[PDB]
Paper text:
Soluble MAC ([name]) is an immune activation complex that is formed from MAC assembly precursors released into plasma and scavenged by blood-based chaperones. In accordance with lower resolution studies, we find that C5b supports the assembly of complement proteins (C6, C7, C8, and C9) into an arc-like arrangement of MACPF domains. Similar to MAC15, [name] contains a single copy of the complement proteins C5b, C6, C7, and C8 while the stoichiometry of C9 varied between one to three copies. As the molecular weights of secreted clusterin and vitronectin are ~80 kDa and ~75 kDa, respectively, we attribute this excess to multiple copies of both these chaperones. These data confirm that [name] is a heterogeneous assembly comprising a single copy of a conserved core complex (C5b6, C7, and C8) together with multiple copies of C9, clusterin and vitronectin in a mixture of stoichiometries.
Given the extensive cross-links observed between the chaperones and C9 (and Source data file), we subtracted density corresponding to proteins C5b6, C7, and C8 from the raw EM images and focused our refinement on the C9 component of the complex. In doing so, we resolve a 10 nm stretch of density that bridges the negatively charged crown of C9 lipoprotein receptor class A (LDL) domains. This density caps a similarly negatively charged polymerizing face of the C9 MACPF and sterically obstructs additional C9 binding. We also observe a second belt of density below the C9 epidermal growth factor (EGF) domains. We then plotted the location of complement protein residues in our [name]-[name] model that uniquely cross-link to each chaperone. We find that cross-links between clusterin and C9 congregate around the two extra densities observed in our focus-refined map. By contrast, unique cross-links between vitronectin and C9 lie on the back face of the map. Taken together, our data demonstrate that clusterin likely occupies some or all of the extra density present above the C9 LDL domains in our focus-refined map. The electrostatic surface potential of the clusterin core model reveals a contiguous patch of positive charge, complementary to the surface charge of C9 at the interface with clusterin in [name]. Density for clusterin at this site is the most well resolved in the [name]-[name] maps; therefore, the interaction is likely secured through repeated contacts across oligomers.
Author numbering:
A (entry chain C): 146 to 194
B (entry chain B): 393 to 433
The structure:
Amino acid sequence: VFSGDGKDFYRLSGNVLSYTFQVKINNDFNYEFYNSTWSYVKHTSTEHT
Amino acid sequence: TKVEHRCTTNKLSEKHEGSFIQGAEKSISLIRGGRSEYGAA
């Protein structure tokens, strides 16, 4: 067989029913992101004369 | 003579600030055929 990948000829045994040289590449990506931020202020005063 | 003067005073304040963001991405891809160098690419 001539492999269309790695670009070479190869020999096969009578033990293998089929050696194919198809290519498939299947990719799945998941990227998930969070960010959060807070700020707070309180003040009081109580006064006399 | 007698005189007296008196007072009381009070004050309050607040401030708040807030932020959030969220992102999500997915990719799914099937390549069939290629040399796996560029099928990879």
